[PDB]
């Protein structure tokens, strides 16, 4: 009884618009009198090979941007490039603008993606920022400008805008100031994300979710120290566990009466021994896209 | 590159309200001037062992029902029971009422769940109605009255409202007329869902999703017959495959140039041989909560 869960998307649906420029169309994020979208909307197909964005944007004028909010065209009255995102000022402020902010997330953190096409939402799902600054998403052509987000209190925290796919099938994009996550560039060339690693603190969170849900075959008598556990995790390309990670997991430990280091001994066993064909929360693998926060939010409402 | 994906939840968020009767509080669904919620909101803790709902409801009047859409208190002017759901007529039509219908989904079909607590949405995810009429959700106390739904065009089809958990951890509830999916009753007694079965057509659809996403290690040079494949499906508690299933899968067979019966052969072998430790779309198991429809809509 523990699912991958996304935040309600309603506050965000009313921010999505359609942005066209030439024959390239993608999604924009309409907040106040500004629409944010990926700058590569100004590229033809030839340009994407090795674009000079400054030069390409000079040749553009306000009226080359067809922005549609539903059955309504909005008039573009300005434009700037901020790193890899375009900001088209518009003559209408979005009445559906929520309380919001822009954040740059840390690797290991999760967020919800509102996948859109032609400015219309099709679906929402939960993602993690991988340690190598990619996300394993579900993105097709036209999905660029779709945004990732958290909701905390009344406040929408925008943290991602989608730009590209990499040869491994994973995805890359920017924060809402246009700075990529990771070493990527918005040009059409094969690019390497580097070795991904497993988010150890999230796997321990998911094991606590498993215990909280009456699924505890993997517990043992033993224990370990942070040092000895990291000796093992390195071998399997797990992020090393800090003490801050132990204190993050404190509340989950409190709810289960299982000390973090005791749980680490259980994970050490699972990595060295494998699942043996058993399952954990209906999964035949170890799951690393739940933060401790996500587990608390779900397991206590 | 293929994820479980829920519909956008905005049209439904604006329908969720808080229903209180006594000390019991759960969620209701506000459409036009009617709030729908589970009838066990009128139960105390004692009553839940074996309630006489007709008798329990007599003792209630309109003013025993507190309804709040956010901070807005709605005044209840009428109450009726329809099967296992209460309808509270209220003095205000919901300005955010979407285009909606009520439908009763078939097993093997999927829908999105807007999990709510105290009339406020906390999250959304995708579910399937299992063959044994249960769903594998994430519901805690206070989650009753949360609804499951599909969106086609601008039209919200409401198909589920949540009522209870079974001892196995799976979940049971009603359509929006209050008729349970499955043999269940809204009383706090042990209740059996019976042997679950695997939604064969959905597994085939997911294997097609896999091939569309560059993952074909499981394909083979063998083939098989409908009748031959089903002999093996019985063994493993799989719904049998009809030719309707074959035709529903027609669009996916096209897109990949793999014939359904060839895929049935690859599936037969996975059932017989196992996954040999490998994976398909990042799962070490066979997934059966994607309809052919879901796979199409995602991959195109
Ligand atoms: C909605 O508010 C809750 C949700 C329930 C609580 C835990 N997880 C859930 O999904 N529903 C209930 O409290 C019902 C109300 C009755 C009038 C049906 N009770 C309930 O779900 O009890 C669950 C347990 C304790 C397992 O008992 C039952 C109840 C019904 C059938 C069973 F097989 C077992």
Curated annotation (Swiss-Prot), chain A:
Cross-link (Glycyl lysine isopeptide (Lys-Gly) (interchain with G-Cter in ubiquitin)): 4, 89
Active site, UniProt feature: 40, 144
Compartments in which it is found: Host cytoplasm; Host Golgi apparatus; Host nucleus
Catalytic activity annotation: TSAVLQ-|-SGFRK-NH2 and SGVTFQ-|-GKFKK the two peptides corresponding to the two self-cleavage sites of the SARS 3C-like proteinase are the two most reactive peptide substrates. The enzyme exhibits a strong preference for substrates containing Gln at P1 position and Leu at P2 position
Result of changing residue 131 to H: In strain: Omicron/BA.1, Omicron/BA.2, Omicron/BA.2.12.1, Omicron/BA.2.75, Omicron/BA.4, Omicron/BA.5, Omicron/BQ.1.1, Omicron/XBB.1.5, Omicron/EG.5.1
Cytoplasmic side: 1-301
Activity regulation statement: Inhibited by pyridone-containing alpha-ketoamides compounds 13a and 13b. In turn, alpha-ketoamide 13b (tert-butyl (1-((S)-1-(((S)-4-(benzylamino)-3,4-dioxo-1-((S)-2-oxopyrrolidin-3-yl)butan-2-yl)amino)-3-cyclopropyl-1-oxopropan-2-yl)-2-oxo-1,2-dihydropyridin-3-yl)carbamate) inhibits SARS-CoV-2 replication in human lung cells. Inhibited ex vivo by michael acceptor inhibitor N3. Inhibited ex vivo by compound 11a and 11b.
Residues of the Peptidase C30 domain: 1-301
Highest rank taxon of the organism: Viruses
Result of altering residue 204 to V: In strain: Zeta/P.2
Protein's job: Cleaves the C-terminus of replicase polyprotein at 11 sites. Recognizes substrates containing the core sequence [ILMVF]-Q-|-[SGACN]. Cleaves and inactivates human TRMT1, preventing tRNA guanine(26)-dimethylation of tRNAs. May cleave human NLRP1 in lung epithelial cells, thereby activating the NLRP1 inflammasome pathway. May cleave human GSDMD, triggering alternative GSDME-mediated epithelial cell death upon activation of the NLRP1 inflammasome, which may enhance the release interleukins 1B, 6, 16 and 18. Also able to bind an ADP-ribose-1''-phosphate (ADRP).
Subunit-structure text: 3CL-PRO exists as monomer and homodimer. Only the homodimer shows catalytic activity. Interacts with host FBXO22; this interaction promotes the proteasomal degradation of nsp5.
Stated name of the protein: 3C-like proteinase nsp5
Species in which this protein is naturally found: Severe acute respiratory syndrome coronavirus 2 (2019-nCoV)
Span covered, complete protein: 3265 to 3565 of 7096
């Amino acid at each position: 009884g523990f699912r991958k869960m996304a935040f309600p998307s309603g506050k965000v649906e009313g921010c999505m618009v359609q942005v066209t420029c030439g024959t390239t169309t993608l999604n924009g994020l309409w907040l106040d009198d500004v629409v944010y979208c990926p700058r590569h909307v100004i590229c033809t197909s030839e340009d994407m090979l090795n674009p000079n964005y400054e030069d390409l944007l000079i040749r553009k004028s306000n009226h080359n941007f067809l922005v549609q909010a539903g059955n309504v065209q909005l008039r573009v009255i300005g434009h700037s490039m901020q790193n890899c995102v375009l900001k088209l000022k518009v003559d209408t402020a979005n009445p559906k603008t929520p309380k919001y902010k822009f954040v740059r997330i840390q690797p290991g953190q999760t967020f919800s993606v509102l996948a859109c096409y032609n400015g219309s939402p099709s679906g929402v799902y939960q993602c993690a920022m991988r340690p190598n600054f990619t996300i394993k998403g579900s993105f097709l052509n036209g999905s660029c400008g779709s945004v990732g987000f958290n909701i905390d209190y009344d406040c929408v925290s925008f943290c991602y805008m989608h730009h590209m796919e990499l040869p491994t099938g994973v995805h890359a994009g920017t924060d809402l100031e246009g700075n990529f996550y990771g070493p990527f560039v918005d040009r059409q060339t094969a690019q390497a994300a580097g070795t991904d690693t497993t988010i150890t603190v999230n796997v321990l969170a998911w094991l606590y979710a498993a215990v909280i849900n009456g699924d505890r075959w993997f517990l043992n008598r033993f224990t370990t120290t942070l040092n000895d556990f990291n000796l093992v995790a390195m071998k399997y390309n797990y992020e090393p566990l800090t003490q801050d990670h132990v204190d993050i997991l404190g509340p989950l430990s409190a709810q289960t009466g299982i000390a973090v280091l005791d749980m680490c001994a259980s994970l050490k066993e699972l990595l060295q021994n494998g699942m043996n064909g058993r399952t954990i929360l209906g999964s035949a693998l170890l799951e690393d896209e739940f933060t401790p926060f996500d587990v608390v939010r779900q397991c206590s409402g």
